[PDB]
Design a binder for this molecule. Sequence first.
Ligand SMILES: *[C@H](C)[C@H]1/C(=C/c2[nH]c(/C=C3N=C(/C=C4\NC(=O)C(CC)=C4C)C(C)=C\3CCC(=O)O)c(CCC(=O)O)c2C)NC(=O)[C@@H]1C
Ligand SMILES: *[C@H](C)[C@H]1/C(=C/c2[nH]c(/C=C3N=C(/C=C4\NC(=O)C(CC)=C4C)C(C)=C\3CCC(=O)O)c(CCC(=O)O)c2C)NC(=O)[C@@H]1C
Lengths: 158, 158
Amino acid sequence: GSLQNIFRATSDEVRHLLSCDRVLVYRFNPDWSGEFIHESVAQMWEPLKDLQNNFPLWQDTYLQENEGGRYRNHESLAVGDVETAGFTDCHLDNLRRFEIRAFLTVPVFVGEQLWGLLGAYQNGAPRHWQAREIHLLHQIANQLGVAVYQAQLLARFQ
Amino acid sequence: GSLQNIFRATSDEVRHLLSCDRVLVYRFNPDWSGEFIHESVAQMWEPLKDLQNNFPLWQDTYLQENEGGRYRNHESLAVGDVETAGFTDCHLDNLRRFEIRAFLTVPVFVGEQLWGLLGAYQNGAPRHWQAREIHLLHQIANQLGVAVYQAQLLARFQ
Ligand SMILES: *[C@H](C)[C@H]1/C(=C/c2[nH]c(/C=C3N=C(/C=C4\NC(=O)C(CC)=C4C)C(C)=C\3CCC(=O)O)c(CCC(=O)O)c2C)NC(=O)[C@@H]1C
Ligand SMILES: *[C@H](C)[C@H]1/C(=C/c2[nH]c(/C=C3N=C(/C=C4\NC(=O)C(CC)=C4C)C(C)=C\3CCC(=O)O)c(CCC(=O)O)c2C)NC(=O)[C@@H]1C
């Protein structure tokens, strides 16, 4: 509740600051599968969130098998054109399915834990992500993670 | 500056809530030695902080050699009477030097790192620390660590 407010604020802020088309918050499950729990999207695009406020599944075997992959090391991935990135077909198929032409995805650490991912997406054209934008989203995600942990500390004690 | 305000608020809050005699904030150095950086103490006791706002050294070889010891695992140590605890003499000597008769010392995690320790001390009598008090100080330290990390995130970016 207070949490969805945090996710809304952050996601809308990213979309506003980066002028991207979609922003997603993705939370890892214990087995390193994950779940979308928030979307900010411009009105011209089909939303991933349906009318029951449910999201599609992105079953990324690679993140799961590598228990978060590069994100374990506080690293991000910026891809300017998914079509030229040399991705595995099952991965590219999901990128296309979610109308992702370019993405910038950074880790969200909550306390000491890799809690999830924060993604910024361009839907209708490639995008050369600037080093500054990467640095900015990295910090927005750090701030999100601290907000989540702060909320947990208050909610779960007294 | 804003940091010393955080340390003051936390330390004074602990001393107030626990009705203990002294509270100390101890920050680890890279080599797992450490430094006192704040004290809250009742007026009837000699302070550890001198007129130059410098603190004495507590050179604890055990914390250093064990890179933080039990505190690496989010554990605390509560000792009701240092005189009956079976401590090594070099350790007991420092406890006596700092007028510590009973202590409750918990870890302070800043993001993913064991940043320091938060200690509550009784100076003039033994004290049986209640499980609740241990649980409370543990959370006050969690909150302190989040405040420190939040301050760092804001101070060091833009
Ligand atoms: C094959 C059956 C499935 C598959 C394989 C796959 N994935 C990757 C690499 C990554 N997948 C992601 C997933 C996401 N990006 C986002 O923006 C979001 C929402 C926030 C998700 C869930 C990411 C970030 C990576 C990079 C991971 C890294 O550590 O670098 C690979 C490796 C790269 C490649 O394509 O060869 C593979 C093989 N993903 C699927 O969806 C298939 C069902
Ligand atoms: C011997 C030359 C020196 C020595 C040895 C020593 N220390 C310990 C165990 C601990 N020492 C501390 C230190 C602190 N308690 C506080 O409240 C503060 C300020 C915040 C400090 C710096 C702590 C917390 C422990 C417990 C550590 C743990 O992981 O359990 C030992 C082991 C216990 C024993 O006495 O045998 C030893 C041998 N400490 C000194 O000061 C000597 C100079």
